[PDB]
Design a protein around this ligand. Structure first.
Ligand SMILES: O=C(O)[C@@](O)(COP(=O)(O)O)[C@H](O)[C@H](O)COP(=O)(O)O
Ligand SMILES: O=C(O)[C@@](O)(COP(=O)(O)O)[C@H](O)[C@H](O)COP(=O)(O)O
Ligand SMILES: [Mg+2]
Ligand SMILES: [Mg+2]
Lengths: 452, 454, 92
């Protein structure tokens, strides 16, 4: 029992916040059978800061000053809050900046394997100014795409995008062909998360072809076109080489290219590798694999809200927030709070209010089983459409091709921005009307009388 | 949309798929959500893990279908799902054509973990065929390199007696270096606790020269080489490189006594590979802090500890924490010994797949987590050998007589097991080991009830 | 740039105020204003930090944070390290 040392329930959360010297974390935790709640929380805090499972002869009074402390519990609700003194976290020797790997190592590291704990999951975290100030933060935003697209730099509207489908299998020539088609009616194309340098579609062969499709589509449409290329790799040198080659290839239009990183499976080190080597390129955070812990089915790790929040510290220009229940992946309408926390200077989490002291915003990237017919309902819940939207099947699954699917996705956006029913808007826009016939199951559910 | 006709081929024989050597096989424990058929859900699973989506797209061609991932076995009653991944699906480096673990994870355990029609899915085993396994870095060093520096036999050299500098955080540079010197008087190996680095109260540039001094002094008085494992984990690879370069420079003539520790689960495979490829001649100490978020048996998602450790060998970890197999404080079971065998043998058996490694270098298990002198004999009885790196933080500095005594007790206990001498009989003629019983009486009572009257 | 396609101020100077400053038939010429259209201005790096970053570190308001009280170490040259560091501490 280490409760006397690592537990101080007499501390008030409002004082700990006002002090600005603690990183607060709200966990949903349940001990194993035969273990008390507070005793378990104190051991949790010990193994997440300075302690072990026994007393050691090397502990001194200074060590006790940086102990993480349990300052609030609710056994009936399985709630536990721990305050981490900021001095616990690692710092770079090259520039003294903070690092996300240290926060994860402590707040959600060895404590996920303790035997006396059934589970524990982070649902919120408060970063004080002196800590948040040390993180890279985003360097670019959807604002940078709006600028290239010559759109309003505030409330510039939805960026009409897609994902090249098939996820894998398209050889270079058909790949660039599909890119050209979508860009005839769309703005943004991203690599599907695993596309890179497969033997049947080498990167050095496909990228010059994608650049040509961009140049052609730009000349025929008179509009700028954006791309997002996957550079994820185990070796940072491979990431750099991919980024360099892609920039030289796209040449004068290199500022039209975002860099995608599978940051959850590759890790924050991959994300920060791209963030610091290519700060002038839009960092597209793809969260493939996050569901292993973020799913509500899981009681361990951290929630999607916390995952996306930490991505703003790492410096993502945009990150996938999910369809918030309107797509094919797990999500809830209340996930709108994730978007607000990423784009605003002041927003509310499940437990903690967070100010960002002017740190740049991260743009929500909405994707996953979406199409023209599903966008109005999704935006009614979010409250605005100033997001990046990518619909793979929603565009190429269009019976009339990707170019019409792109136009249908755009038309769906304007229909919502102006408060016009999608069916009423579909009578004067064949591409949108074709989406209804392309996805009749969705049409029957969202607009029952569409055939008439 | 039922996609079983395309992504499901239950007529394929697993033995043929392994014989062909052209598919990565994965065995999942998967349960669909209510109202979704098992096979149709599994077909969708394979589609979102290879070439497909949730609707038909006009871009699909016959070539695409050729590289589809295929469900070749399902046991609905037992929630089993096996998928075969054509090796051509996975990404390759443009600089050297080598494989990357990030791509395998993106496909085999990426977006499929967020599908709304699946309740959960967890990988329990994976088979890598030769043509794919051959493309991974694999380990460059081993406990054999530690045995060589320690001037011990390079086969069955025995346990490396190690510890973790406790407190986990808070020890300033001077007491830190003092605890290091004391343990090395009786021990072999010291590792940073997983979060120790460049805290403002213990700067790296200040503490590292003191650790090297403690290493030098201990080596001079004991006439034995001493090892240290330094944490270099960071978000920025430039920081990782800077730390490694400074540490190697500081240790100078004893730079080969230093291992580099990387918190590979939270920092990711990119941090592990960054160290593996920049410092291939320094022992790579993979620390898995955070892994329990998926590997815990309580979790039905992600991958098991067995799968996590097996992949660490592909990334090139010289050693990784396999857990205490139920004999320590962390979660584990005695059957986790299969993890060690899969890491250190050229031919081992997994829960579903037998794996040969074609001479790829072994990864050494690291045993840690609430261990001490009393708990080691039972753990090695279950493993069958003591060729591991053992670190006991509380087991060493929790000794009533200090860290030095704790180190001797750990070594003495290991020798006791290696020569088949009961621990209590060994304590009769080794005071340091005897003190370990009094230091941890709750453990002495359980594992050696009659320790007091003897 | 061939490495990233960005603009370079050097090219602007070379053309707008380069060889034209040595012509024999011109007594003098001096730029008093210049307009950069969006498609050109958008290709420049632009500032990455501001006084806002200074206000943040000083824990001041990020809008209308006020004057940053500063000095230049004098003598311009000749202060050895010890007195130089002593002058720094005094002003801070
Ligand atoms: O492969 C996919 O599954 C997607 O392209 C959606 O496909 P479609 O749009 O083509 O149907 C998105 O990447 C995922 O939704 C990513 O997950 P999240 O948004 O949840 O990060
Ligand atoms: O912080 C800790 O808990 C440890 O230093 C153990 O300290 P003690 O020896 O004092 O218990 C190790 O990191 C864990 O053993 C890692 O767990 P695993 O090896 O299972 O990944
Ligand atoms: Mg995708
Ligand atoms: Mg540790």
């Amino acid at each position: 029992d280490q409760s006397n040392r690592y537990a101080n329930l007499s501390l008030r959360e409002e004082d700990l916040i006002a002090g600005g010297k603690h990183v607060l974390c709200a966990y949903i935790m349940k001990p194993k059978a035969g273990y008390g709640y507070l005793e378990s929380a104190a051991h949790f805090a010990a193994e997440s800061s300075t302690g072990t499972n026994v007393e050691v002869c090397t502990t001194d009074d200074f060590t006790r000053g940086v102990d993480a402390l349990v300052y609030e519990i609710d056994e009936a609700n399985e709630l536990m809050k721990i305050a981490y003194p900021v001095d616990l976290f690692d710092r770079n020797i090259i520039d003294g900046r903070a690092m996300l790997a240290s926060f994860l190592t402590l707040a959600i590291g060895n404590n996920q394997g303790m035997g006396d704990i059934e589970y524990a999951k982070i649902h919120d975290v408060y970063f004080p100014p002196c800590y948040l100030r040390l993180f890279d933060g985003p360097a670019m935003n959807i604002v940078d795409m709006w600028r290239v697209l010559e759109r309003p730099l505030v409330d510039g509207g939805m960026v009409v995008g897609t994902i090249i489908k098939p996820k894998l299998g398209l050889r270079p020539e058909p790949f660039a062909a599909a890119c050209y088609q979508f860009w005839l009616g769309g703005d943004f194309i991203k690599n599907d998360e695993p596309q890179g340098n497969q033997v049947f579609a080498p990167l050095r062969t496909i990228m010059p072809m994608i650049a040509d499709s961009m140049r052609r589509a730009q000349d025929e449409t008179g509009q700028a076109k954006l791309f997002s290329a996957n550079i994820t790799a185990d070796d940072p040198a491979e990431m750099y080489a991919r980024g360099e080659f892609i920039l030289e290839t796209f040449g004068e239009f290199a500022d039209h290219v975002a860099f995608l990183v599978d940051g959850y499976v590759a890790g924050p080190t991959a994300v920060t590798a791209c963030r610091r080597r290519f700060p002038q390129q839009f960092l597209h955070y793809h969260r493939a694999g996050h569901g292993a812990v973020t799913s509500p089915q899981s009681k361990r790790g951290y929630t999607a809200f916390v995952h996306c929040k930490m991505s703003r510290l790492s410096g993502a220009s945009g990150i996938h927030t999910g369809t918030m229940g309107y797509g094919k992946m797990e999500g809830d309408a209340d996930d709108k709070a994730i978007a607000y926390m990423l784009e605003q200077d002041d927003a509310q989490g499940p437990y903690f209010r967070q100010t960002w002291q002017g740190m740049k915003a991260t743009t929500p990237i909405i994707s996953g089983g979406m199409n023209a017919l599903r966008l109005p309902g999704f935006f009614d819940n979010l409250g605005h459409s100033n997001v990046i939207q990518t619909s793979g099947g929603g565009a190429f699954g269009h019976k009339d091709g990707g170019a019409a699917g792109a136009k249908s996705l755009r038309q769906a956006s304007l229909a919502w921005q102006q408060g016009v029913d999608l069916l009423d808007y579909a009578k004067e826009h064949p591409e949108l009307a074709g989406a209804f016939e392309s996805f009749p199951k969705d049409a029957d559910a969202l607009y029952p009388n569409w055939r008439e």
